[PDB]
Design a protein around this ligand. Structure first.
Ligand SMILES: *[C@H](CCCCCC(=O)O)[C@H](C)N
Ligand SMILES: *[C@H](CCCCCC(=O)O)[C@H](C)N
Lengths: 327, 327
């Protein structure tokens, strides 16, 4: 609180903006750094989040904020300009190697400290796993899949698993209600890619005409099933179950702020007594995606710094470490 | 699996017996050591659990098992006789300093490795907190309150807390159905001590006449409220909330194996968006007390060994560390 963790956010779409708002009341964490594609903002005294959001939404980049710098190498620039202890990578993984490529930038820069992502797709977390020794040698402590799911729900399953001799199934069912289309339309193609007959390339190339066309066919509801979702490999690496016993689905209602169903994870297994049973972890319907992604993300950044300060570098998942409550 | 964790159990009432049964199918953990008040059993090749339970239930001590040694200093003897990497302290805290006194024995012996308890009462965990430097200097890694509650539910609350700016309440409600009076009547006074107008001294002095008298007044139901329960100090030490915002209650049905209500923990707080909401973690009704106490206990022993192998000694609670799934 005399010595808060100095943190940055890379990416300032809806998620990074929400992360900035979440950090505002924190005593022991201070936002000093934001970057987007076209500009960055450093302030060792703490970001003016109102000014950064104005700049981004009104002028298209935080580079246009007071103290903002326009730059086409915004991330390269920001890394070198300021004392930052940990970054939240609130970047869409677009192209599908970008998170790994931003991370390769961090490795290349000679910067050390904590990185946290809220990656979703198994194949994305697999690219970060390939970098675990590169990260370790660099002196980076990297927390992967530390959002809502993967993240919060993955940790809940890892704890719930302790009652069982054998895990049979981990089933994640999420709900999202969109309150502000503005701070979502940037990322809707990420969700549509999981729709039947879609892939990341097909979703990303869609026009708003095609998006509105698709959404009108279901009153703005995206019912997603058997998603490529890194909870599977994270629980597998944690020794809890095989990735094939993990299934992720959910509902995003693009036309209602109200969560369309209660986010939960159900962990089914057999106990040492041979009894088959299930634990369920259910999220409150008034906890938003932002709260359930960004809250854990900074809890893992804080846990990560704890690991970093004890000399433990490399790659950790949300299934591997207990997140620390941030005040 | 070529090199399993060699573990012991101190105390062989219903809980220690259940812990022995839980370890039986494990590949990467091997039970080598049991002790009770009047005898001990060491076997580096792995305990015959059938023989140990026969001896205990039939002859009143594992000292009477094959390879068993009768001894009135059973714990002092066992510690010195065998290579054991971690012990589960499945001892009733009777008298109320016994767990701390057994732990002072471990500190005095020069033995190092992992200890785990399933203590319940705040004041008991407070006695272990006083010993944290003694433990560290001794080279012991001590995992306290690593049962069902405290333990599993405490870790669930620590994870659930990450969605919130401020915690308002953590409410734990547990159910226990007693299947076998035999493996419970030894510990029923532990639960009765939490009944209205009772304390530990009054409960412990009760005759079976007085117990049966009390139980007949409620068809064998013990409805317990605002218990002295270490989940409060564990979540406080974890920086999550004040101990006064933690409340523990539940129901033990002494006359039915069926769990009388679903064990759950409800975490209420305010999100960064100012919204009040609750997460709920609910246990399966066919997960027994044994599974939900002993499963986590060995998950924390395994996590503890991981901490020990990286040179981290002293005192950890279930709120502080992610338990590791034991195969
Ligand atoms: C990513 C998943 C969001 C999880 C929402 C959980 C909740 O807040 O209850 C979306 C689908 N892009
Ligand atoms: C200790 C508490 C047991 C917790 C039971 C939880 C469950 O298995 O659902 C007892 C009251 N002695």
């Amino acid at each position: 609180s005399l010595a808060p963790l100095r943190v940055g956010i890379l990416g300032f779409g809806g998620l990074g903006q929400a992360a900035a708002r979440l950090l505002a009341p924190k005593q022991e964490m201070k936002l000093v750094a934001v970057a987007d594609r076209h500009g960055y903002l450093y302030d060792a005294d703490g970001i003016d989040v109102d000014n950064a959001v104005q700049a981004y939404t009104q002028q298209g980049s935080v580079g246009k904020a007071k103290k903002g710098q326009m730059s086409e190498q915004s991330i390269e620039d920001l890394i070198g300009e300021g004392e930052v202890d940990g970054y939240f990578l609130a970047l869409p993984n677009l192209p599908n190697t970008f998170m790994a490529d931003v991370t390769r930038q961090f490795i290349a820069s000679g910067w050390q400290g904590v990185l946290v992502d809220a990656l979703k797709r198994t194949s994305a977390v697999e690219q970060l796993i390939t970098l675990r020794e590169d990260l370790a040698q660099a002196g980076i402590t990297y927390m992967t899949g530390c959002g809502a799911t993967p993240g919060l729900l993955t940790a809940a399953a890892a704890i719930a698993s302790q009652s069982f001799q054998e895990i049979h199934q981990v089933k994640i069912t999420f709900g999202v209600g969109i309150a502000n289309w503005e701070a979502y339309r940037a990322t809707i193609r990420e969700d549509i890619a999981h729709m039947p007959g879609y892939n990341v390339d097909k979703a990303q190339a869609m026009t708003d005409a095609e998006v509105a066309a698709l959404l009108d066919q279901t009153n703005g509801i995206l019912a997603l099933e058997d998603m490529e979702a890194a909870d599977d490999i994270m629980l597998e690496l944690a020794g809890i179950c095989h990735r094939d016993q993990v299934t992720v689905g959910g509902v995003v209602d693009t036309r209602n702020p109200k969560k369309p169903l209660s986010t939960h994870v159900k962990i089914t297994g057999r106990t040492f007594e041979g009894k088959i049973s299930s634990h369920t972890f259910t999220l409150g319907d008034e906890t938003s995606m932002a709260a359930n992604v960004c809250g854990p993300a900074f809890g893992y950044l804080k846990a990560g710094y704890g690991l970093h300060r004890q000399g433990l570098k490399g790659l950790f998942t949300a299934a591997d470490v207990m997140p620390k409550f941030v005040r």
